[PDB]
Point group: C5
Chain length 204, copies 5
């Protein structure tokens, strides 16, 4: 509903209040997905990048940054973590995909593939989520934790109900994502809560 | 007023005495500003780069270097800090802007944007400042602190009453800044106190 | 058998179970061999890359990574280790050859030769192995150890009953290996046990 | 008196005895000077590069290296130090100038300007010096200290009674120095004492 | 008597037994020499590269590597050491010359000159040596020490009875050495003892 092309959400301070709710009419459990976005933060502590909870289910789909050079994906509370060489601080483009049939999770950082890991083969990610940027949920939509808050900037966020092949991940990294059907930065339905400011993306 | 094109102020030693007063007929409170300048220092300790105090108000607008790789902006005593990868020692070009309506502070270091932070949304920076280079003020024009003194060289200082877009920041970095209406290096009204020497800029 | 051109085995989690059995029909003791393969793992702990045991004989031919930058070859329980400068994590191409007549072991890492070492001169590597990827054997086909399990991806595996000269090693590294007579990725007889997934090779 | 083009003094060992006296008919106190030379040493401890003392005055003009990356100039016992990024060990080209009227000292290391510092504004460096390479003087011509001795090679030394502008500094660095009126490598009047060997310059 | 062009000695293991004796027609004491060779080792501990002892005289001419980045030359039991920036592990080309008349020792590492040092000015290196690769002699031909043994590969060894100019050093480094009258890799008289294997040089 809003085209955020060329813009970012700025989470300008540490808080337990500041967040964006992302709204998607996701009625069917997810068997496959890819999520891509850009982020720029100079936090050294742990923080959540993308928090997806469902009723009665915490950490149903969570992209979490434990520390520099380490990215984690949670699926139904279980997690995998893969490492990468990265500068700090530095803008980053992140893609992560997961496929129920194999359980394989693929992280791509700045268009470079990390080591594949695997979890929750056969599982379906539950539907009707609450999806939050800026805070890590411990409840269905809430129970945030200041020490897990994201401070910095996020943009170019897209989510597909399939596993993107390498050349489509590269297209997203280059700023030309293929059509996305779960979340789309160019037609995004969202709710700002607390202190979140929309600004031009100046670091790509 | 003096055209300091191609020249720098040299603060050649640590002291509590040496400083430059910058004079501007600033009568109305500031809602928006951008400040750019070049500096070269081999201090490892903390130091003030640009100190702006008003009657009864400390750190009304302060650009302060905590340590290598970390830049702070104070607005009305409140502070934000953002990090960057930089060599040490090394000449640097710094721009910082702040916008009351959003509270957003943007640092640019050698033409590269740091992570945005936010403070004092809705605040107006007071007018009738005393503006000092070389020392950090704790009073209106004084109460300096040797351990916060700037030792080294500063040049190409410009201050605008608006937030510069990236193209204008890069122009400043490259040595062709837009005309500036609060402070302008090519028409600077200043007072040297103590040991400050004007020399050609040899390090750009 | 199976042509795995353009594919890898993914060992997506640490376990004492997940492995691939590799079957060679060439049944003879080995006086000379070369083994080449690609691997991508972000483990920092020790792990087995290629485990070849015979009846009643542990570590008959073993390629083992004790830590970053250090590759070990075991021949008949004796071991040599050579060091290399490598980024971590990073995909790697590994070739190792051994020649009974001299005892010389040559490791090549990304087409660069490591320092030669020597062991078991005059020895013959025993015939009729169980050859395992993903786990380190302590028995004939079993007695695995989760703390030595391989997590990550292996592809482009070839094994010859001769010592390859540098030009052939470079050919393998570049993706044009000479056909191999003990094990060949383009005609591989394998058995997956437990959680191992075949995926496209996306990192080379 | 001697043309040392393409040659260095080699101080091949640590001692309290080995040195070179440089003779100049300098009768007028110095208001301005520049000194350039090349050096190559693998000492990590402190050492004197150029020691100029006058009767009753220690450290009248001294260029001293306290540790890697730090160069000091003394004028009349007072000192300033500036820092630089440098590899170790590595050959270096050093220029330093000082100007009484401003007190400004400029170090240039491999043609790169260090941060300016200032000392002894208004002072005149005393004439009738004893000038020593290889040792640091604490008396007029003597009282050396082996813990301050220079072990290594020095060449292409020039001293002018003016402050060289950047173009002339770069010319010296690139091997086209302006002829010099206090000390000049093409016509150097020197006395070797102890173990000092003249050899071709093979490193720069 | 053997042309070892394109080949190396491989010392494939740590031992107190494995060594090569080099045989030269040298009855006259040495006043000048240059020694060049190429080596590739991943030892971190100290080791001997070239050990030349005479009757009743230990360390008469010894090239020894105490630790990464540091090369030592002994002449008649006296030693000098010079430092260099180098990668580890990495193939290296080493030349060292010594001149009795000046005492000057020149090390060149990968065609780069180290800081000159000086020792034993006026001394004559004794004749009738036993020359050993692979072990450090403490007696005339023996008393080896496993903790000083060279493990790895040595090739392209030449020794001249003169001090080579830089152009000739660079020629050796580049693979076109001048003919050498004390030891010549292309016409070498040697004795292998213990486990030493001749292999092609694959790392140049
Ligand atoms: C998702 O995964 C693929 C297999 O790669 C298909 O099995 C697909 O049907 C899966 N599920 C869907 C589209 O819902
Ligand atoms: C400053 O900020 C902008 C908003 O982009 C404007 O609101 C501008 O009017 C503001 N204030 C002034 C005095 O120019
Ligand atoms: C192995 O090594 C080759 C060449 O080095 C031959 O010597 C070969 O006979 C060796 N042994 C074999 C093939 O059994
Ligand atoms: C010396 O230094 C120069 C600056 O380059 C001038 O200031 C000059 O007047 C100074 N004084 C003398 C004696 O030459
Ligand atoms: C070295 O020593 C003797 C014997 O070779 C002379 O030849 C001498 O000239 C040599 N070289 C020099 C410069 O001393
Ligand atoms: Ca949670
Ligand atoms: Ca939480
Ligand atoms: Ca203050
Ligand atoms: Ca203060
Ligand atoms: Ca085993
Ligand atoms: Ca085991
Ligand atoms: Ca002194
Ligand atoms: Ca002294
Ligand atoms: Ca010895
Ligand atoms: Ca010994």
């Amino acid at each position: 509903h809003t085209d955020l092309s060329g813009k970012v959400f700025v989470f300008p301070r540490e808080s337990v209040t500041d967040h964006v709710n992302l709204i998607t009419p996701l009625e069917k459990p997810l068997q496959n997905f890819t999520l891509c976005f850009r982020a720029y933060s100079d936090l050294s502590r742990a923080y959540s990048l993308f928090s997806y909870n469902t009723q009665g289910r915490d950490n149903e789909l969570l992209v979490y940054k434990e520390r520099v050079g380490e990215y984690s994906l949670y699926i139904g509370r279980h997690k995998v973590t893969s490492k990468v060489i990265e500068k700090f601080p530095a803008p980053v483009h992140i893609c992560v995909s997961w496929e129920s049939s194999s359980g394989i999770a693929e992280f791509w950082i700045n268009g470079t593939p990390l080591v594949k890991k695997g979890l929750r083969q056969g599982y379906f990610v539950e539907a009707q989520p609450k999806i939050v940027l800026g805070q890590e949920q411990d409840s269905y939509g809430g129970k945030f934790d200041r020490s897990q808050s994201f401070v910095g900037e996020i943009g170019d966020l897209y989510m597909w109900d399939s596993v993107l092949p390498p050349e489509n991940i590269l297209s997203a990294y280059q700023g030309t994502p293929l059509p996305a059907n779960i979340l789309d930065w160019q037609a995004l339905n969202y709710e700002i809560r607390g202190y979140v400011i929309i600004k031009p993306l100046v670091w790509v």
